Amino acid sequence: VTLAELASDIQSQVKVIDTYLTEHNLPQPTFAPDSPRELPLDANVQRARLLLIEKAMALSNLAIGAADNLRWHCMNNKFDDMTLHFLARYNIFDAVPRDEPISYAELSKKVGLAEHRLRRIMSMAYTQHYFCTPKPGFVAHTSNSAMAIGDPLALAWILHNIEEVQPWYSNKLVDATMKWGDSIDPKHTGPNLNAKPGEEKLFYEIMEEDDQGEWNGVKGKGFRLWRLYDTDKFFGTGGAIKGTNLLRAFDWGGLGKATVVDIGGITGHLASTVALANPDLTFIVQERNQPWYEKQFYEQLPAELNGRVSYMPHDKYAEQPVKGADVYFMSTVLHKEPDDKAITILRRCVEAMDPNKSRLLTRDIVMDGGDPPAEDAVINGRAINSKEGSYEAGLGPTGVITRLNIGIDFQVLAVVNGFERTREEWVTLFKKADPRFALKGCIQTVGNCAALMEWILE
Amino acid sequence: VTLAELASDIQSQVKVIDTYLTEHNLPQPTFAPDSPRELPLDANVQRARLLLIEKAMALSNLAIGAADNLRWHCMNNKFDDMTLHFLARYNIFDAVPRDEPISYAELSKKVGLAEHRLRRIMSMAYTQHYFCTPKPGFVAHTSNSAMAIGDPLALAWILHNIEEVQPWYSNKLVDATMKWGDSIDPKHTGPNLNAKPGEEKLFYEIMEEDDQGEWNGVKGKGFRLWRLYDTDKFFGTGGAIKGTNLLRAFDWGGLGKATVVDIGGITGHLASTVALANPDLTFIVQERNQPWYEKQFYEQLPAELNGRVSYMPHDKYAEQPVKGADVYFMSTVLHKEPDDKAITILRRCVEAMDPNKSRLLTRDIVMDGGDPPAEDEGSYEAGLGPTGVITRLNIGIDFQVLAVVNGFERTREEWVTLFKKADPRFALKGCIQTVGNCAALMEWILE
């Protein structure tokens, strides 16, 4: 591919998006804080968007050239993370007013970062379109920075990656690989590289047991796990894997009066999303208890739910105490479970299921991709705006959704030696748990990286 | 700005590059291993290139949207670094044939990385155009990965940042700032967060004293400093700060028969580049000695130089032993020196200079930009401005010296002020920055 070929492809993708926004009288995305944070969910818009990102990243890569890419990368990449580290730890998103500029001098006093160093930090952020300088000596928000205003969940995601995953796990993953090999054992991780055998600590042990800190209303024991739960909510409120996309990948309203068992449902934010939109559903959120869990669980659930979402302490490997429920639901649980642990969980579910009335629903990454929601299946436009070679838009070796999938694949690899699966690996795994399992649906909305898979016992 | 405006701007810049390459019958850049690794040095091509990168990065950012940018960045960014970490530590660049595919199974046996994890590593590399998969189960090089074949300097740059700068310094820079403030003391850095007052360790002390390792022909003491020296060479051999760009920013041949004193010249690769192109110049490389330095210095020195490049041990803060030389040369030295330390070095140079026969030349970042060589839209020159690609590289180096030694980059006015404090006779006669380069060649004289 050449520079001109990529630039020509990019124009094709923009025409699709630009036309849709104009024909529907929808605001254009910009870098202003008032910009829309997402493009429309229309499948053709999203397919064009995903290819546009892929082509645009390739264009910048090709124009930088082979000589400068590795050179520039090792110099700059790590400092985009450190810039977000400064912005989070110094609470700079909240200190910069959303709709009006602020001078470096005033911002320096508000956050307690010396002005000279503050200017250097902000200048790096500008290059990735986080904040801008509208006039000399002044800082203003952009769309990318304004989304984090007043949102501790965004700050949780910054700090969890830069202060935990990266220094403790991903930076030591090479050493972990040469010491233990290609492992699926959560003990074979960074923090245990120099641990005496028997004294290893697991990632989730550190999360729930460390008490030397505080986070967003939780003081002492488990503050890291509470921050981890905040980052789980962060991916539910917006973006690729937003919770409301669940409503588009399964006919929740078709269940009528029904009970859903949310195995491993964190704090129930996902259950809360589906239940608010479906007044006839009951959700039992099953999760391991924590000293702060029950008080926080009930402070944050919307009161209009009238107790339809409730918390039941439960060990996911133990016998399922709710028998014959309409749906047993696991969201991004099994991608942290090797085959033998996942088969244990799936067999616990099968025991409680009525094969003629119960469904098993999982949201997980399907590495080779799920299917679009039926109405989006037929490609009504040009292939250049919906297909990269033989792969669906967003997939393939340089696909943007492929990239996000691998990023999550690496995330569970780093912390617990988990892994993502293909569709055939999922079907094989469920059939090992019980040969009666059959995949009736594998729905992945365009722009989403996770698929909602509905399993039944035939 | 909107998606359509950026895409239209991109077409304008690509047109410049596409036309120049066609009208001069030059090969197009691609991702194939045989691709040209750089675009032509023509200033207009480079200006279009720099704006093109800036416009393309804005386009991908805008298309990702505000909701997904922060969510995706903190998920994937750090794993682009880790992927290169695996590729370097497992020697995968060299194990994949340049012009031939290799299967995952065969590559796994060659590098000792189980095939399943190898596939996961390679798949992430693909998304940033490092390697590709031309057929199921097979790996091939791209242009971005082929540049590192047989090049230990490339691997040194990967390992220096991910195994040293990032875990020891940049990761801890927030903590460093809250413990010591906006400091300029090289002791007030990451590794010393829990050090007792007085027993702090300096970055270059760790570099030259650690012996628990080995790198590229150096075993034991100083292996990290030798690896650091390799990464300094790495930026000379190609790309933005390539050594040959010096030949375009100063009339070296105009010096005639002359001697250059290279203060802080690492291993002399920069001197070797200028001296090979100018047979009438002598270079004295002045640098702090190391047990492995002298043997390594002369083995890597091109024999064609006939000793015109020589090593003289010297403390940059001490009296300059070479009097009245034609040029006193410091490349990316002073950006690691606070004002008072830098003034000390400059005054050492002034003492040895003949004001009527000596020049002082520095290569350093000019944060607001230098001027282009003779021959060569908003308020900023291409590559500069708050989202400029060269601005980004400048800040990255600014952050690099900030992390390791609490250094900082300067604007042109800050440079002039600093030299005049050292000696009021100093005058900036030239501040030449080739387009596509981030460093400027500054020529100082004593009036």
Ligand SMILES: C=C[C@@H]1C[C@H](C)C[C@H](C)[C@H]1c1c(O)cc[nH]c1=O
């Ligand atoms: C906190 C939730 C994040 C959400 C993203 C989507 C995926 C990621 C594996 C997940 C996560 C864990 O599940 C567990 C540990 N560390 C994590 O980062």
Ligand SMILES: C=C[C@@H]1C[C@H](C)C[C@H](C)[C@H]1c1c(O)cc[nH]c1=O
């Ligand atoms: C090793 C040389 C690199 C080259 C790049 C161009 C500039 C960077 C500040 C430099 C560097 C040092 O000078 C010193 C310590 N650590 C570094 O990374």
